[PDB]
Ligand binder design. Structure first.
Ligand SMILES: [Cu+2]
Length: 227
C-alpha cells in the first residue's frame, strides 16, 4: 500500500497527488499527477484489469498540469514507504495525449512500455525484486525518457505490481500512478501502443504466480518493451 507523493524533474520537485489529503480537502491544488479515489492507499487487482480503473488507478482523472522534461531527461518518482513484503516488478509506460493531457479520455490512451524491472535475484525465495530496489533507493524510482520518440505531451504510467498474494486468481495487486509530461527533443518514433484495459490478464504467467517457490525466471507482464 502506498502512492507517489513527489516527482523530481530537472532540479525541482513537483508535488504528487496526495491521495490521503486531497480527496478530503476543500479544495485541492493543481498538480501534474492524476487524481484517484484510491484513498485506501490500495490497488487494482485482476478483477479490474478489463475496467477503466487499471488505466491510472481507481476513478482516476487527468492532472491539470504538465511537467516539461529535458531531452532524454530523468523523472524520479518518490513513493510513500513501500512494504518489503510487497515484492514485484516496477513497470513504466508512456501514452501520447495528442493534445493537452489534462483533457484526455483515459480509455483511449495507447500505452507503450518504456522500462520494466522484475525479479532481480532469487538466492533466497521469495527473492529480491524491482520493488526491493525501489525500497533500497529510499522509496524512489528513476525513469529515463527515451530520446527516440516523437516529442509531445504524454501520460507516464508508473506502476508497482505486488505479488505476495498472487498465488490465487486476481491476487496480484497493481499500483499504477499517472503523471503528465511534456517530452522534448528530436525523436520521431510513435511506438505501437496498448489500451490500458489490454495491458494485463489475471492468468498472465507473471501475474498468477507463486513467488515463494524457487523461480528460474520471471516473465514481466504487459506488452513488449520499446527499444
Ligand atoms: Cu499493500
Amino acid at each position: 500500500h502506498g502512492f507517489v507523493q513527489n516527482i523530481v524533474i530537472d532540479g525541482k520537485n513537483y508535488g504528487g497527488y496526495l491521495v490521503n489529503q486531497y480527496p478530503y480537502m476543500s479544495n485541492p491544488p493543481e498538480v501534474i499527477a492524476w487524481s484517484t479515489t484510491a484513498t485506501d492507499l490500495g490497488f487494482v487487482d485482476g478483477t479490474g484489469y478489463q475496467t477503466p480503473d487499471i488505466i491510472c488507478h481507481r476513478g482516476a482523472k487527468p492532472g491539470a498540469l504538465t511537467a516539461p522534461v529535458s531531452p532524454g531527461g530523468t523523472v524520479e518518482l518518490q513513493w510513500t514507504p513501500w512494504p518489503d513484503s510487497h515484492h514485484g516488478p516496477v513497470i513504466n509506460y508512456l501514452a501520447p495525449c495528442n493534445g493537452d493531457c489534462s483533457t484526455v479520455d483515459k480509455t483511449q490512451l495507447e500505452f507503450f512500455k518504456i522500462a520494466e524491472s522484475g525479479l532481480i535475484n532469487d538466492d533466497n525465495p521469495p527473492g529480491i525484486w524491482a520493488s526491493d530496489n525501489l525500497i533500497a533507493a529510499n522509496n524512489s524510482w528513476t525513469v529515463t525518457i527515451p530520446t527516440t520518440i516523437a516529442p509531445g505531451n504524454y501520460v507516464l504510467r508508473h506502476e508497482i505490481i505486488a505479488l505476495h498474494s498472487a498465488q490465487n486468481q486476481d491476487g496480484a495487486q497493481n499500483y499504477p500512478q499517472c503523471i503528465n509530461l511534456q517530452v522534448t527533443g528530436g525523436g520521431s518514433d510513435n511506438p505501437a501502443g496498448t489500451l490500458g484495459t489490454a495491458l494485463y490478464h489475471d492468468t498472465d504467467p507473471g501475474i498468477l504466480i507463486n513467488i515463494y517457490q524457487k523461480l528460474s525466471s520471471y516473465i514481466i507482464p504487459g506488452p513488449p518493451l520499446y527499444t
